[PDB]
Design a protein around this ligand. Structure first.
Ligand SMILES: Cc1ncc(COP(=O)(O)O)c(CN[C@H](CF)CCC(=O)O)c1O
Ligand SMILES: Cc1ncc(COP(=O)(O)O)c(CN[C@H](CF)CCC(=O)O)c1O
Lengths: 360, 360
């Protein structure tokens, strides 16, 4: 099987410093072996939380203390916990299109979920004003899946909405925030907030490996107060993985890895986009390519979205359609992930994509 | 700080084959490295599930197929999932005393939880008959915390109750089931069932390390059918830890480890009990010492339970009281864990316990 992946759900393994990660694991183990016989602190190991706290403060401008952070064996399990801290009758609002898994979670939890359309600045403040939700779920760095980078002006507008009335919350899902392309980084919503109505959520799945299972979220003082009154929660993220992450960060291996990958991802994205317009002779529209590890491609073709997806499968091309992210009409659109995609598979994979779309 | 631990929440690190575990990790990694770039199958990696399936079939007699198993980053997260598969208005029944964390979870989930007292055969079938619950939560191998081993006759009685009426479930929490002392092993409730009304739950926290975070549960066909209709769940247990566990088991390292520890735990328990009656001159009543990694000690003393716990702290002795496990009166009773307890700390720790109980 000679498969080529344009999947957004896969990550890079070719350039991941797996030997350094293991060497960090050995060092952390031989240093904190005796602690492995006990269960971790429910919020996660303090030193690990402190290591992440410093990191996100530098890279995203996030203001927090380690006592506010909770780890974190996946965004969903943390989101599950978060819904139980927020008001039970809270009305949730998600981006349309958006993360369907998180949508289905909220629906299955008996919560009312409203869908918010997007403009060129991302999540529409006009629609939020109209539908009047309680909790916002947004992806500022790189809108999942449209890829729109929410500008500061829109970020300020959401912050104002949350601040002008009591019991309003913003869940900043800062997924896929490590990378931008020929545009500058923008501070997180949580950092621009003059108050404390933002829950910041992050993950290491795209910067490290998705199989590692480490996420985190930062609670506002009152929500943190509600969490501590539980007293029955147990840490879900592995202790070995926590201590390995701490060493990986503090040894400087993480920053060294990120520095290497921004250049790698920049070059690969450039080649892929160049190859796309070359093969399609400019008959492909690329959207949301200024950040993240995926972008969107629309096609002027007589074929439907599943006809394309079907042919791609027969051509051994792993790809997903944009209708996957509909929560609640025009040219067919696909999502193109280039994290796992090997550089040598670019020209071949783009040729296979052409056949899946046009036929020949 | 020269602390001695009688804690039931700690595990053995002195005799854990940590170097073998890492060597298993290296072998599994170099063999399945490419899979680390993708998220695991939501139920867990199939080969890992199959490895656990064969294991529990041999040791506990559990009848199941890998398709029925779900991993599994902790019993609580699996129990959380289980409450969402079972009927929403299901009335739960737990052992009194029992696992307070699991009790608080169910209460926080808006579920009605009834408490069932114990007799010499464990969870009272007479009280279950009287209170008429929907779902039973029990710990047959070693009752948490009383330590009573549920005999087959009582196991059969619970199975009959669940089978004589529709929509009745038994959650077999087979925690602390690896070890018995001078008594024979008893097949799991799930294995003795002539039908399929039992959910079998297990963990590797006591056989391996609690920081590893690997648990599992086996669903009945209909409950499995309800799980698959979700389609939004993500695996919470680390992929590296899964693949390491598989290698650890299949290489024969696990069986070799268990064989070594049963002899270790047997000798240590014997010495501890011998030391207890020697120091206390026979004025200590030991209960529930035929299995598990802890037993119960009652004391004829004028001191209350927290006076004892307080003095133990000042004497640098980590210990917990039995009132910790009350869900909803006589001689003070403490729980004595001997998993982490070093052999050289037995005589000293038992002397410290005497001072905490009697004063001198
Ligand atoms: C909106 C969003 N926030 C966070 C994550 C990270 O979750 P975690 O690693 O468990 O912390 C994802 C990633 N979701 C998966 C990407 F591979 C699945 C995509 C699909 O269902 O199309 C995501 O979309
Ligand atoms: C009844 C019961 N079933 C399972 C587990 C194992 O859970 P997990 O490792 O996450 O799979 C425990 C262990 N509970 C902890 C033991 F250290 C805490 C004890 C306390 O709260 O007293 C337990 O009591």
């Amino acid at each position: 099987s000679d498969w080529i992946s344009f999947s957004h759900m896969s990550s890079d393994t070719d350039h991941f410093p797996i030997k350094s990660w293991f060497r960090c694991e050995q060092k952390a183990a031989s240093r904190s072996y005796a602690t492995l016989g006990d269960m971790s602190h429910p919020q996660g190991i303090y030193e690990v939380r402190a290591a992440i706290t410093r990191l996100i403060s530098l890279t995203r401008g996030v203001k927090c203390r380690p006592e506010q952070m909770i780890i974190g064996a996946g965004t969903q399990v943390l989101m599950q916990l978060l819904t139980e801290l927020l008001p039970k009758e809270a009305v949730y609002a998600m981006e349309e299109p958006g993360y369907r898994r998180m949508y289905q979670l909220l629906k299955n939890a008996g919560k009312q979920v409203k869908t918010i359309m997007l403009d060129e600045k991302g999540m529409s403040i006009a629609e939020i004003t109209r539908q009047q939700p309680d909790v916002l779920v947004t992806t500022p760095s790189h809108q999942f899946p449209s890829g729109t980078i929410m500008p500061v002006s829109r970020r300020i507008q959401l912050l104002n909405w949350a601040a002008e009335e009591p019991a309003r919350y913003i869940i900043e899902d800062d997924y896929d925030s490590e990378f931008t392309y020929d545009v500058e980084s923008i501070p997180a919503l949580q950092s621009l907030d003059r108050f404390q109505n933002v829950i910041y959520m992050g993950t290491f799945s795209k910067s490290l490996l998705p199989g590692l299972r480490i996420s985190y979220m930062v609670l506002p003082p009152e929500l943190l107060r509600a969490y501590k009154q539980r007293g029955y929660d147990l840490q879900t993220c592995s202790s070995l993985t926590q201590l390995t992450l701490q060493e990986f960060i503090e040894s400087g291996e993480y920053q060294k890895h990120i520095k290497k990958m921004k250049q790698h991802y920049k070059e690969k994205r450039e080649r892929l986009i160049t190859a796309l317009e070359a093969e399609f002779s400019g008959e492909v529209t690329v959207k949301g390519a200024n950040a993240g590890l995926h972008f969107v491609t629309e096609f002027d073709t007589r074929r439907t979205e599943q006809d394309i997806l079907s042919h791609a499968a027969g051509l051994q091309l792993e790809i997903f359609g944009m209708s996957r992210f509909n929560l609640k009409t025009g040219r067919p659109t696909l999502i193109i992930g280039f994290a796992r995609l090997k550089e040598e598979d670019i020209q071949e994979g783009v040729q296979r994509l052409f056949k899946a779309v046009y036929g020949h």
